[PDB]
Amino acid sequence: MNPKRIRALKSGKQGDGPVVYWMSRDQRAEDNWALLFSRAIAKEANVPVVVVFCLTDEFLEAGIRQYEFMLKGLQELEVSLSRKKIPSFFLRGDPGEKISRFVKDYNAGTLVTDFSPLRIKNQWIEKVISGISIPFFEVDAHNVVPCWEASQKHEYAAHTFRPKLYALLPEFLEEFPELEPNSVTPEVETLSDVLETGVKALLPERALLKNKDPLFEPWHFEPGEKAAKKVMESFIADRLDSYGALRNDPTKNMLSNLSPYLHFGQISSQRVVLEVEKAESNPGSKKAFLDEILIWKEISDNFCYYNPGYDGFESFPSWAKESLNAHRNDVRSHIYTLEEFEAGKTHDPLWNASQMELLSTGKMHGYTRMYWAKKILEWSESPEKALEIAICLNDRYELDGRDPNGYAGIAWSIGGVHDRAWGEREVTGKIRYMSYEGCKRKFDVKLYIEKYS
Ligand SMILES: Cc1cc2nc3c(=O)[nH]c(=O)nc-3n(C[C@H](O)[C@H](O)[C@H](O)COP(=O)(O)OP(=O)(O)OC[C@H]3O[C@@H](n4cnc5c(N)ncnc54)[C@H](O)[C@@H]3O)c2cc1C
Sign of torsion, CA 237 238 239 241?
positive
Cα separation, 287 vs 59, in Å, equals 37
Cα separation, 213 vs 384, in Å, equals 34
Cα separation, 161 vs 167, in Å, equals 10
Residue after which a domain boundary falls, among 279, 312, 345: 312
Cα separation, 94 vs 178, in Å, equals 32
Cα separation, 359 vs 208, in Å, equals 9
Q: Specify whether the CB–CB gap between 439 and 449 falls below 8 A.
A: no
Residue to mutate (ligand 1; options 249, 259, 270, 431; most atoms within 8 A of CB): 259
Whether residues 155 and 276 fall in one domain: yes
Cα separation, 102 vs 113, in Å, equals 14
Residue to mutate (ligand 1; options 292, 294, 432; most atoms within 8 A of CB): 292
Has 352 been labeled as part of a binding site?
A: no
Cα of 363 from ligand 1 centre, angstroms:
9
Cα of 160 from ligand 1 centre, angstroms:
20
Has 275 been labeled as part of a binding site?
A: no
Closest residue (by CA) to atom 38 of ligand 1? 292
Which residues approach ligand 1 with their CB closer than 6 A?
247, 255-259, 262-263, 292-293, 296-297, 300, 366, 369-370, 373, 394, 398, 400-401, 403, 405-406, 409-410, 413
Sign of torsion, CA 412 416 417 419?
positive
Range of the domain at 331: 313-453
Q: Specify whether the CB–CB gap between 113 and 22 falls below 8 A.
A: yes
Whether residues 339 and 442 fall in one domain: yes
- The total of structural domains in the chain comes to 3
User: What is the side-by-side order of every strand in the sheet holding 111-114?
Assistant: 6-10, 136-139, 111-114, 19-22, 49-55, 88-92
Entry resolution (Å): 2.3
Whether residues 369 and 292 fall in one domain: no
Has 405 been labeled as part of a binding site?
A: yes
Burial of 163 (C-beta count, 10 Å sphere; 0-12/13-18/19+)? exposed
Cα separation, 66 vs 96, in Å, equals 23
Cα separation, 353 vs 451, in Å, equals 8
Has 249 been labeled as part of a binding site?
A: no
Cα separation, 379 vs 339, in Å, equals 13
Residue to mutate (ligand 1; options 254, 361, 369, 374; most atoms within 8 A of CB): 369
Whether residues 420 and 432 fall in one domain: yes
Whether residues 96 and 151 fall in one domain: no
Has 82 been labeled as part of a binding site?
A: no
Whether residues 157 and 119 fall in one domain: no
Residue environment code for 273-309, b if the CB has 16+ CB neighbours within 10 A, otherwise e: bbebeeeebeeebbebbbebbbbbbbbbbbbbbbbee
Q: What is the DSSP letter of 130?
A: T
Amino acid 123 reads Q
CA 253 → CA 179, 220, 224, 244, 438, distances in Å? 34, 12, 21, 13, 21
Report which of 93, 77, 119 is spatially closest to residue 395, judged by C-alpha positions.
119
Report which of 36, 39, 17 is spatially closest to residue 26, judged by C-alpha positions.
36
Residue environment code for 91-129, b if the CB has 16+ CB neighbours within 10 A, otherwise e: bbebbbebbbebbeebebbbbbbbbbbbeebeebbebbe
Closest residue (by CA) to atom 7 of ligand 1? 406
Cα separation, 445 vs 274, in Å, equals 35
Q: How many CA atoms lie within 13 A of 424 on its CB side?
A: 9
Q: Checking DSSP bridges between strand 88-92 and strand 111-114, what pairing results, if any?
A: unpaired
Has 292 been labeled as part of a binding site?
A: yes
Helical pair 64-83 and 225-234, crossing angle rounded to 10 deg = 100
Whether residues 202 and 333 fall in one domain: no
Residue after which a domain boundary falls, among 312, 329, 344: 312
Burial of 167 (C-beta count, 10 Å sphere; 0-12/13-18/19+)? exposed
Whether residues 321 and 226 fall in one domain: no
Has 98 been labeled as part of a binding site?
A: no
Cα separation, 39 vs 33, in Å, equals 10
Cα separation, 53 vs 81, in Å, equals 13
Whether residues 70 and 205 fall in one domain: no
Whether residues 137 and 170 fall in one domain: no
Whether residues 197 and 320 fall in one domain: no
Whether residues 33 and 61 fall in one domain: yes
Cα of 405 from ligand 1 centre, angstroms:
6
Residue after which a domain boundary falls, among 141, 167, 199: 141
Type and span of the H or E element at 6: strand 6-10
The phi, psi pair for 49, rounded to 5°, reads: -100, 145
Rg (CA), the chain: 22
Report which of 212, 196, 211, 2 is spatially closest to residue 92, judged by C-alpha positions.
196
Residue to mutate (ligand 1; options 400, 407, 419; most atoms within 8 A of CB): 400
Cα separation, 31 vs 261, in Å, equals 13
